[PDB]
């Protein structure tokens, strides 16, 4: 194809269509710079060649030249205002840039021009999901399902991304099939390297009896992945394991990256090795026994590495809440609550069970200042109106007279001169004050005091004050929260929440501007459900530490059934906040119930929507019961396995050895569910 094309150019250099076709093929091959040369020839030969501009824009996009891509799409549309593809491509630039209203407008233009346009319709559907625009929602869902069905039948890559497929009422069969098609994109890409299969280790002799485990991630740095597992590499037992971390991203300068680089036995920066064949060779050279895929179909993934099968056992872990659908992945690390044996068919991988939950979080290490708290009695005694946290909080409390200890142990500071000064700082919006030599910080001002503490890179070194007044929350009412991105909400979920709010007069729902353009849509739908504006309170997204800390102000978290809080679920639990959940069928919809089961709070898991409402309302109205459940969460976040990274790592190690012994005995992968 390429050698034939080049000959056609050696024969006839002024062949615009040919240049543009040769560029496209080169693009597919990953030879982006070479492709650029030919697109440029095409547009010189014919200044009105809109298709070439559009395709050139695609190439620039892949080269990470977003502004250049936008310029190309813009020229294409100027040359041909009715060019539907170019409008859709422009919309994608707007989308990826975070400008959803502009994306929506451009996709709508694309669909006006070409009503049968799966990529544009499905991308528009995701935009609408992001901002909670549920206009014609039921019909939209039906159309998405119909589009996927048609594309699968016709052997075309589906327009619904596998990560997004969790959000739509697709069958498990369809969801797995979408994932499988993406798996195949990877196989096709590496097939062209014509690399032979790798010879894999058959024992642990060359590694001195240690199992060599490779963790592959684009998220070793400031990203949820590291916020969950950054302690795990350093907790592996060096007598039995040798840990290799393979980074798909450059060093972002954060302490998260520092920690993993310092604690892994080996750290390899594959961001410096763009070729998947060479990168796979490097992994194979290291002698990895179990290679762990921490991306799945998420940003930064290089699943081509796994398609090349450099290791004898390859497992999905933690980073992607779904199946890879890919034959080159052997196992998915999960648990009996998240992925009961009954639904093994939803997954291409064999199930490998951790004993409690597969979920983990680094909160005990990142946010140890939240292990204990004190309150200020600004009047009964509340545990979530005015809260103090700090490594040195006990010493501060010991410097005060008349501190009362409330038992069920929560220290309570009485309304005195000290308490007034703390409250005045908050009311005045002051950054910090000093009391008895101790540093007392306004929890809204962490970035001005220590920006590394604000992001979770360092433990705060001051005592922090958190109050309902900082966020405009009522002092005399129940606060239900949900701190997820708004895309996780659907009409049925908001209706449930409205039903709860109507049954609990003295209550509000606390949501985030995530993004802010979703706020007006949620508010309109709430109003249509008969809830006045003041029943729902919005706050901005906050730095990581403030986000986890402020969860202490809520009474109850109402989890999203469509796709649960994952990281976000761990965050809320660490603050001691009960979370009500309704597990569904997909992995993404069952994570919160798995977290709660490990924690030991079965009473917070609902079997259906009526039970979810009833549980939420009981917590909001039976105040002794609320005190009991909050007490249970507060204690069990410490005593349960949920946040115990050492225990988790040890259980992971047991699982790895089971996988290895199974392979070493000559067996192909099978479920590890006992």
């Amino acid at each position: 194809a390429v050698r034939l094309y080049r000959k056609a150019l050696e024969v006839f250099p002024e062949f615009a269509a040919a240049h543009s076709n040769l560029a496209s093929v080169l693009q597919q091959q990953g030879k982006l710079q070479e492709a650029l040369m030919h697109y440029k020839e095409a547009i010189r030969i014919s200044p009105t060649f809109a298709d070439a501009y559009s395709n050139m824009g695609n190439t620039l996009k892949e080269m990470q030249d977003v502004q250049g891509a936008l310029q190309c799409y813009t020229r294409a549309i100027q040359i041909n205002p009715a060019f539907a593809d170019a409008h859709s491509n422009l919309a994608s630039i707007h989308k990826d840039s975070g400008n959803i209203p502009e994306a929506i407008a451009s996709y709508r233009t694309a669909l006006k021009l070409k009503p049968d346009f799966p990529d544009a319709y499905c991308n528009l559907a995701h935009c609408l999901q992001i901002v909670c625009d549920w206009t014609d929602y039921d019909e939209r869902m039906k159309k998405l399902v119909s589009i996927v069905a048609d594309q699968l039948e016709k052997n075309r890559l589906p327009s619904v991304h596998p990560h997004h497929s969790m959000l739509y009422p697709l069958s498990h069969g369809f969801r797995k099939a979408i994932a499988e098609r993406h798996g195949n994109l990877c196989l096709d890409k590496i097939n062209v390297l014509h690399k032979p299969p790798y010879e894999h280790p058959k024992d642990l002799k060359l590694s001195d009896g240690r199992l060599r485990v490779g963790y592959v991630s684009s998220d070793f740095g400031n990203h949820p992945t590291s916020h969950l597992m950054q302690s795990i590499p350093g907790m592996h037992n060096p007598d039995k394991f040798e840990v290799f971390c393979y980074a798909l991203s450059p060093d972002d300068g954060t302490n998260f990256r520092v920690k993993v680089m310092a604690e892994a036995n080996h750290f390899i920066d594959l961001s410096q090795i763009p070729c998947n064949g060479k990168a796979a060779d490097r992994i194979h050279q290291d002698g990895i026994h179990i290679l762990v895929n921490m991306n799945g179909y998420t940003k930064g993934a290089r699943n081509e590495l796994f398609a090349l099968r450099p290791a004898p056992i390859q497992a999905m872990w933690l980073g992607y809440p779904g199946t890879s659908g890919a034959l080159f992945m052997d196992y998915i690390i999960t648990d009996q609550e998240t992925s009961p044996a009954e639904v093994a068919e939803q997954y291409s991988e064999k199930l490998a069970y951790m004993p409690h939950t597969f979920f983990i979080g680094d909160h005990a290490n990142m946010f140890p200042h939240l292990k204990k708290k004190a309150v200020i009695d600004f009047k009964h005694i509340y545990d979530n109106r005015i809260v103090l946290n700090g490594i040195d909080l006990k010493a501060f409390l010991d410097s005060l007279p008349d501190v009362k200890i409330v038992k069920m142990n929560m220290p309570v500071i009485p309304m005195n001169t000290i308490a007034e000064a703390v409250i005045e700082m908050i009311n005045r919006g002051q950054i910090q004050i000093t009391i008895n030599g101790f540093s007392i910080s306004n929890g809204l001002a962490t970035t001005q005091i220590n920006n590394k503490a604000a992001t979770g890179e360092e433990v705060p070194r001051t005592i922090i004050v958190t109050t309902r007044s900082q966020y405009g929350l009522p002092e005399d009412a129940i606060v239900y929260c949900n701190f997820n991105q708004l895309y996780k909400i659907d009409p049925s979920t908001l209706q449930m929440w409205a039903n709860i709010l109507k049954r609990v007069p003295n209550s509000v729902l606390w949501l985030l501007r995530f993004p802010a353009v979703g706020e007006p849509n949620i508010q309109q739908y709430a109003q249509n459900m008969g809830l006045p504006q003041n029943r729902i309170i919005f706050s901005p997204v906050a730095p990581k530490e403030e986000h986890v800390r402020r969860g202490q102000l809520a009474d109850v978290c109402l989890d999203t059934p469509l796709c649960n809080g994952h990281t976000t679920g761990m965050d809320v639990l660490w603050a001691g906040t009960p979370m009500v959940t309704m597990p569904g069928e997909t992995l993404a919809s069952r994570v919160a119930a798995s977290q709660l089961t490990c924690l030991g709070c079965l009473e917070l898991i609902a079997k259906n929507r009526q039970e979810y409402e009833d549980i939420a309302v009981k917590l909001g109205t039976d105040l002794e019961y609320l005190k009991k459940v909050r007490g249970k969460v507060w204690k069990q976040r410490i005593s349960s396995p949920l946040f115990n990274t050492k225990q988790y790592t040890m259980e992971l190690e047991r699982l790895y050895l089971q996988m290895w012994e199974h392979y070493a005995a000559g067996n192909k992968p099978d479920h590890m569910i006992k």
């Binding site: 892949e62 994109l185 949820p224 991306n295 994952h566």
Partner: peptide, 14 residues
């Protein structure tokens, strides 16, 4: 967060 950045889980390009 406004004035900073809050990384989240998101899909890869296709």
């Amino acid at each position: 967060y406004p004035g900073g950045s809050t990384p989240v889980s998101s899909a890869n390009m296709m």
